[PDB]
């Protein structure tokens, strides 16, 4: 049962927040970005965002985000993000998203409606780290395995 | 055991009076005086569902 | 300010470790004489006085 | 400002002392101690019975 | 425009000493300079931690 | 800035130590945040060296 | 911006088209974000690379156009920071200017 573990956000509702970088200027954002935290190895990063994933306005992929009080919604697969390449959005749960970021200096979250365009720029640095003595940035084909620790891929 | 907090009533914390659909603000205060509490994810998860 | 019969409480600023000096007070000379001690700070934020 | 001093190792009895900086007012340091205690590093080989 | 604005540094003092520990969030100046008819300044830039007596 | 700004007694101990050098700044003109400048992660720092 | 509000008028062999001006896109390494354009001119918001891609897409056709020019990235004061801050102290500056005046 997923349903007794997304309970909890189901009491919640998501919210409009500041953005100091967006689409044109500094507005006020659907899409406000509270953290990026990067410390599992292999190019998982863990953003806090203002939004909500995984509720409709439970459906599967989606972000449930607020407009001017109006509560909408759109497929996970219109919303994309960079940090100096794409990266990959894996799965969301409640205020939180699990994608597989490259390096870089920032985030950049983005989606589009009918003809307005969202964004929200941060200046949060996100790093990339390899497991072990080998230097990579994009992990091998082959090789032997070693302990590491990545950040989970459910909801627990 | 451990006994939750609605009113002077020391209620088990898995046995809920009430539900989420039935009450939009009365579930969020159960959980207002238990956030002190070693139960609450019992209180919460029995809480949610019926 | 003097008053009749009262007692005045002047401040002042040296270097000298014995300090002694000859206090002018508008007609007259009075010796002020005294042990001075090193303050508790080694470096402050204003100019020397 | 460092203070060095030696306290003896004894319950019960208040240690009074002050610090004169030179130029200042006398600053007074007590210490009552009340108990102290001593914990080896114990380390269990066997139990034995009837 | 609106600027960063570095970590406070903690300043020990001694006799005729001033050090500075200085953690840095992203690279940034120093600039000290004394006071007399030889100043003697010193343009540097710190981006990691540093200690500077 | 170094290992050990927070310390806690055990994993699970409810009682910390920081000593992180937090100081809050003033928001901007016409927004709701609030601003802070502290020094780094000591345990990131330390793991660099 | 011919009057007509955000779109972009170009000429294709003879015969002057347009396009609205979200259907415009340009990086320089990282995706940028067009403000506003006047005339022959445009406002652009970029960030540092060597070189600078405009492109735009038509029902099949794609056009673009890359030059080698270095766009760079300046900060204001004594911090060398990439992206601009959330929060801090305010600085004078000298940025390009909004309006087409």
């Given at each position: 049962?997923?349903?007794?573990?997304?309970?909890?956000?189901?009491?919640?509702?998501?919210?409009?927040?500041?953005?100091?970088?967006?689409?044109?200027?500094?507005?006020?954002?659907?899409?406000?970005?509270?953290?990026?935290?990067?410390?599992?190895?292999?190019?998982?990063?863990?953003?806090?965002?203002?939004?909500?994933?995984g509720l409709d306005s439970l459906k599967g992929r989606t972000m449930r985000y607020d407009m001017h009080g109006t509560i909408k919604e759109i497929p996970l697969h219109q919303v994309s993000l960079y940090t100096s390449r794409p990266c990959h959005i894996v799965d969301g749960h409640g205020y939180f998203l699990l994608a597989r970021c490259?390096?870089?200096?920032?985030?950049?979250?983005?989606?589009?409606?009918?003809s307005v365009r969202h964004s929200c720029s941060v200046p949060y640095e996100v790093k990339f780290n390899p497991v072990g003595r080998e230097l990579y940035t994009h992990p091998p084909e082959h090789g032997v395995e070693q302990a590491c620790q990545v950040y989970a891929h459910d909801a627990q | 055991t451990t006994m939750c907090l609605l009113a002077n009533v020391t209620f088990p914390c898995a046995q809920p009076p009430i539900?989420?659909?039935?009450?939009?603000?009365?579930?969020?205060?159960?959980?207002?005086?238990?956030?002190?509490?070693?139960?609450?994810?019992?209180?919460?998860?029995?809480?949610?569902?019926? | 300010e003097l008053t009749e019969q009262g007692s005045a409480t002047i401040h002042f600023s040296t270097a000298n470790i014995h300090p002694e000096f000859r206090l002018?007070?508008?007609?007259?000379?009075?010796?002020?004489?005294?042990?001075?001690?090193?303050?508790?700070?080694?470096?402050?934020?204003?100019?020397?006085? | 400002y460092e203070h060095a001093t030696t306290m003896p190792s004894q319950a019960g009895i208040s240690y009074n002392t002050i610090v004169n900086r030179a130029g200042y007012a006398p600053l007074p340091i007590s210490i009552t101690p009340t108990k102290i205690k001593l914990i080896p590093t114990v380390n269990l080989e066997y139990v034995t019975c009837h | 425009c609106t600027v960063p604005l570095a970590p406070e540094p903690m300043i020990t003092f001694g006799f005729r000493s001033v050090s500075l520990k200085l953690h840095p969030k992203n690279p940034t100046y120093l600039i000290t300079r004394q006071l007399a008819d030889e100043p003697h300044y010193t343009h540097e830039l710190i981006s990691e931690p540093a200690v500077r007596n | 800035g170094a290992f050990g700004d927070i310390q806690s007694r055990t994993v699970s101990s409810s009682d910390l130590y920081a000593n992180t050098n937090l100081v809050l700044q003033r928001p901007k003109a016409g927004a709701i945040h609030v601003p802070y400048t502290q020094a780094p992660s000591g345990f990131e720092q330390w793991k660099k060296d």
């Open positions: 049962s997923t349903e007794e573990l997304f309970n909890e956000y189901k009491l919640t509702r998501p919210y409009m927040a500041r953005c100091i970088r967006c689409a044109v200027g500094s507005c006020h954002s659907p899409i406000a970005i509270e953290a990026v935290k990067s410390d599992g190895h292999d190019g998982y990063v863990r953003l806090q965002t203002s939004s909500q994933y490259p390096a870089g200096d920032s985030i950049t979250m983005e989606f589009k409606k009918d | 539900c989420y659909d039935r009450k939009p603000a009365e579930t969020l205060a159960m959980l207002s005086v238990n956030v002190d509490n070693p139960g609450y994810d019992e209180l919460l998860e029995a809480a949610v569902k019926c | 002018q007070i508008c007609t007259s000379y009075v010796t002020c004489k005294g042990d001075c001690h090193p303050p508790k700070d080694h470096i402050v934020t204003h100019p020397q006085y | - | - | -």
